[PDB]
Each structure stands twice: as structure tokens, then as C-alpha cells.
Amino acid sequence: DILLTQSPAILSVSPGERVSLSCRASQSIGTSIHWYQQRTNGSPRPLIKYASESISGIPSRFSGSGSGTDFTLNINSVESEDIADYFCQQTDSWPTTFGAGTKLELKRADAAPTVSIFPPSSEQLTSGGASVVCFLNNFYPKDINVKWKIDGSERQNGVLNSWTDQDSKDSTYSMSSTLTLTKDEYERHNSYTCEATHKTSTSPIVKSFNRNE
Amino acid sequence: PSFYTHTIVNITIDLGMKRSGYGQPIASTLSNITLPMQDNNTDVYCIRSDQFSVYVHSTCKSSLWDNIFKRNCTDVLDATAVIKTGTCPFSFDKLNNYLTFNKFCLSLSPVGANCKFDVAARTRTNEQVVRSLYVIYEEGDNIVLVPR
Amino acid sequence: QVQLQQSGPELVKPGASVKISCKASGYAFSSSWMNWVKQRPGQGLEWIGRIYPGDGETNYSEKFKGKATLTADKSSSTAYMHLSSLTSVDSAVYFCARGGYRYDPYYAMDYWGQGTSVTVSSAKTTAPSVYPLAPTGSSVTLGCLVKGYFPEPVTLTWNSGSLSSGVHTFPAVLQSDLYTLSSSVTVTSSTWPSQSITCNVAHPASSTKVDKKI
Ligand SMILES: *[C@@H]1O[C@H](CO)[C@@H](O[C@@H]2O[C@H](CO)[C@@H](O)[C@H](O)[C@H]2NC(C)=O)[C@H](O)[C@H]1NC(C)=O
Ligand SMILES: *[C@@H]1O[C@H](CO)[C@@H](O[C@@H]2O[C@H](CO)[C@@H](O)[C@H](O)[C@H]2NC(C)=O)[C@H](O)[C@H]1NC(C)=O
């Protein structure tokens, strides 16, 4: 079961840049490797065949290189439509394996998360229901890190984090952390700071509350 | 028919097999074939006889990430070496009457050979030429080939 | 003009079976291999196995033996894939894709289908629970929380489409048996609290609720 490895997992690029993607097989596979592209919500598509062979219909900027265990996918001048996932495929030894894939993001100037915290609403608490949320909108780079805590220290039985794929407008990432709890697990009140950390700066930024106003 | 001497030739064709990413069988080039020795020489074997028959002995071995030709060769990956009319007019199989020669030699080396035989690997799924059996011969009526 | 039309999204209970369709056109359906590939939501491509409709020659990955059955109706131009005993880990989007001619061992997969989403879930149709989110620079940011629904998707607007600026809709997360997502809207303190801003959550569970904010 020959393992393909693509590096790096994520690659920041700007339009016009030259770029190279990588794929290293466990063992020799000759030139029996293919490259596929997959735009978001889309379906895979063959860019380079037998890693150097060009495919009819593919723009001149794509080219393949390598033989043996090292391979590379080249994009001469990056275009906006080039944002996608790229998968290498080994077709030499049974069975045919794919790489984890390399994802392309757009590069922009760094930016910090507008943190906005929210108290449970009056319907939630009615339903014995509760839950507390935190928005960290419009930031970059993606690589971020959150912390909930209650009258000081850590709390982290069940928080759910969701992330937003890059914005097609400002090219930033937003994230929501939601902290769902019962009401008596909550009538047990003390304090709800959703701190945030990000490359942007060593401001753990906090937004918090006790019982309301 | 009749003969004064009848040498029977045992040819061993050890074919190695691999399979591609999509489960497609692939006969390794340099599956080995061995001819009987003869003189200060093995590479080629002329038949010093007025009659002879041929007996092919096939052996298959599987392979993976390596060429470590260790394993059975089951499922489609199996194999039976088959010898095929390569570039010479005769078949090496039954077409009723008999082959006739004044000379007939099988060479593992393409030197001074008249033609080829395409040794291939038959399987349920497809058949694939792996090596070549070169054959030096002369049209005559001294030596006679029988099946097989 | 090669295209492969796949069957619609499936939503199936565990232990049940599914069978995906894939009708081909624009080329000779019988002379090219038809591969099936599994893509999991977060992850990469997993080759399932191929079938050559010319006879019905059928291969399979070791992982998929016994689970996937491939068939091909030659005169229908449609290729099928049957999955048995579905489980949580079987949930995914399955692509059907074209390959090379018979004796091609190393081909790249030529044309792919739009994919078929298959979700395996024990859960029943439940309507969403929506809740209002409330707390300058001055763009005030306000959310709208939906929770405890199934299946997906949910569609969320603001002021009925007459608002599309500081709006995000976080991808739904599985919290339980059920989903939960949040929306975010940002505007100037000038207009809100001053003017009504209502989020609009719809659920093809033929259901719909609108929430305001205070
Ligand atoms: C032809 O020669 C091959 C060797 O090239 C013989 O191979 C033997 O195969 C038998 C089983 O048939 C084994 O028991 C032996 O171990 C093999 N020996 C070797 C050296 O590989 C084969 O027996 C010969 N066939 C005939 C009928 O003469
Ligand atoms: C054909 O012949 C060669 C030996 O003359 C075999 O190649 C060797 O195979 C073993 C493993 O099968 C290795 O340990 C050796 O390193 C190989 N030597 C060379 C020169 O490559 C080969 O296996 C034979 N083919 C088959 C089908 O058995």
C-alpha cells in the first residue's frame, strides 16, 4: 500500500506568482503518476498526465516534472481560478493511491478577528436550553486558536468550532465557537470570557459577560 | 512417425507478474526462460536429432513494491507461459502436418538468429509478450518437429 | 462530448443499502473503464474499484470488497454502484469516473460525474430551533443561532435579502444527532437598534421562522 505525501498541506499564493506543488511516493513508480485539480464543490479534473505529459484543454501554465519517487506540479503564473485542492495519484502499484492533497489559499495582508460574544437568549433558557456563542469574524491568517473559561480557568467539555472557507470578497477567514450547556449548569454563573489568540498579536482578546446588561 | 533418435526439449519459462494500480495484470519483462545446456555453451541449443518434440514448463511468481518474486500468482494475476510465432513463418503449434528442418536452434541471444518467438503470459484477462525466443533454422527434410 | 450524470443525493439509515446511478454519454460506454471513487468531506480520494461494461469485468480495492457492488447496463449507458450495510463512516460523496480502453493499466481518470452525496444517519426530520444573538467602532455585529435540525441544508437570509454586507453563515456542525450553525451580520449602530433587522431561516422540512433582535 504505497503512501503518497504532498507538501505542504496548505500553500499561500498570490495571482501571478510562480508556484510548485510536491508529491513524494513511498517507492519508485516511474512516471505512472497523475495530477488532479478540484475546485470547491466541484469534481476532480486531470491537469497533468504521467507527470509531464500535457493534457489537451489545460492552459500552458500547468506542467509536470519528475520520475521515480519525487514529483512536482508547476503553475507558471497563478490565476484566480487556480484556487483549489490538488491531488497526486499513483497508478503503478496496486492499488492506486491518492495523496492527502495540497490546498491553495489567497494571500493578503494580515488582519485581526472582530470578537463578539453572545449570552443565551430567553427562548433558549426557557427550553432549559442554553448556549453561548462567539464570533471571530474577518481575520487572517486562517491559523487561529480559541479559549473559553469560566470564573477564570479552562472549560472545555463540549465546545463546537466551525470555520469559514476563505472569503471571495475580502479574502479573510471567520470562525464561530459555540458553547452549549444546560441552564442549571448555567445558573451556576460566574464568567464567560471567550479569549482569542492569533498570529496577529499577543493580545489574547477577550469579550465576556456575567448576568446580563 | 518414425525416428532413429528423438530428443525431447524441456524449456522452462519462469514468468514474473505484478499488477497495476487499477488491478491490471502486468507480466514483468525478464521473466526468465532457460534452455538445456549443450557443449561449453548454454545460450543456444541446436537439436542433433532426426526428430524432436518440445515441452514448455511454466512457473509464475507475483510481486509488489519490490521485484521480490516471492508469492503465489492467484486471482487474475496467475499465468501460463505460452510460446508464440514471433517473426518466423512456423507456429510451433499443431497445424496438421509436420515442421521440417535441416537445422533448428533456440537462442537466448539475438545473434545470427533467423526469427523470434514471442513468449507471453496467458491469463483469463489478457496476454502479454515478455521475452523473445530467437531461433536459427534452415529449410530441409532432415529434422522433424512433433507436438505438443 | 463526454459527460457523466450521477443520481441525486441519498439520505439513508444505518444497516440499509444504497445504489448510485451514473449515466454516460458522448463516447462509447462499453469500451472504456468506469471507476468509482469515494471522497470523504474532510479528506482525499479513495479509489473504490472499476468495471468494464464490455463484459462486466469487475475489480475492487481490498477495503471495499463485500461493501461495493458495481454493475453496468450496456444498452442503458448507465453504470451503478451498490453499497450494503451502510454506516456512519460510509457517509460521503461518491464520484464515478472514466478510464482507459480495455488493456490500459495506468490510465488517468478522464471525465468525472458531479458526485453523489450519501449521508448515513439514524436521525429523523426535525425542524430547526432559531434564537436571536445580541451583545462602538461602530459596525455592530449580530448573530442568529439555529440549532437541533436535520437534515441539511438550511438557508438563511437577512431582512429578506435586502441586506448582504457583513453577513457570514458558518458551515453547519454536527453537535449531536443534529446540526447547528450560526450567522453573523455587521452594520452601523446608526441603523440598528434603530431599524428592524430580522434573520430568515428556512428548512426544506417545509418549515420557516423569522427572528428579530432587541
Ligand atoms: C523441466 O525442467 C525444469 C527445470 O527447469 C524442471 O523443474 C522441476 O519441476 C519439478 C516439478 O515439476 C520440481 O519438483 C523440481 O524441483 C523442478 N526442478 C528445478 C531444477 O526447477 C521440470 O521437472 C522439467 N520438466 C520435465 C517434465 O522434464
Ligand atoms: C529472472 O532472473 C533473475 C535472476 O537471474 C531474477 O532476478 C533476481 O530475483 C531475485 C528475487 O526474485 C533477487 O533476489 C535478485 O536480486 C534478482 N537478480 C537480478 C539480477 O535482478 C528474477 O527474479 C527472475 N525472474 C523471475 C520471474 O523469477
Numbering used by the authors:
A (entry chain B): 1 to 213
B (entry chain E): 507 to 654
C (entry chain A): 1 to 135, 141 to 219
Task: Tell me, in the authors' exact words, what the paper reports.
The cell surface aminopeptidase N (APN), a membranebound metalloprotease target for cancer therapy, is a major cell entry receptor for coronaviruses (CoVs), agents that cause important respiratory and enteric diseases. In some CoVs, the virus envelope spike glycoprotein (S) mediates attachment of the virus particles to the host APN protein and cell entry, which is blocked by antibodies that prevent CoV infections. We determined crystal structures of the PRCV RBD in complex with the pAPN ectodomain, and the TGEV RBD in complex with the neutralizing monoclonal antibody (mAb) 1AF10. The RBD adopts a β-barrel fold, with a distinct protruding tip engaged in pAPN recognition.
Crystals were prepared with the SA protein in complex with the Fab fragment of the 1AF10 mAb; the structure of the complex was determined and refined using diffraction data extending to 3.0 Å resolution. The asymmetric unit of the crystals contains two antibody-RBD complexes, one of which is shown in Figure 2. Residues Pro507 to Val650 of the TGEV S protein, previously identified as the pAPN-binding domain, were well defined in the crystal structure. The RBD adopts a β-barrel fold formed by two β-sheets with five β-strands each. N- and C-terminal ends are on the same side of the domain (terminal side), which presumably lies close to other S protein domains; at the opposite side, two β-turns (β1–β2 and β3–β4) form the tip of the barrel, where the mAb binds to the RBD. The immunoglobulin (Ig) variable domains of the mAb heavy (VH) and light (VL) chains contact the β1–β2, β3–β4 and β5–β6 regions of the TGEV RBD, burying a virus protein surface of ∼810 Å2. Complementarity determining regions (CDR) of the antibody heavy (H3) and light (L1 and L3) chains, the N-terminus of the light chain and the C, C′ and C″ β-strands of the VH domain contact the viral RBD tip. The RBD β1–β2 hairpin with Tyr528 at its tip is at the center of the interacting surface and penetrates between the VL and VH Ig domains of the 1AF10 mAb. The RBD residue Tyr528 at the bottom of the pocket contacts mAb residues Trp47H and Tyr107H, whereas its hydroxyl group is hydrogen bonded to the side chain of Gln89L and main chain carbonyl of Tyr107H. The RBD β3–β4 and β5–β6 regions are at the periphery of the epitope; their contribution to interaction with 1AF10 is smaller than that of the β1–β2 region, representing respectively ∼17% and 10% of the RBD surface buried by the mAb.
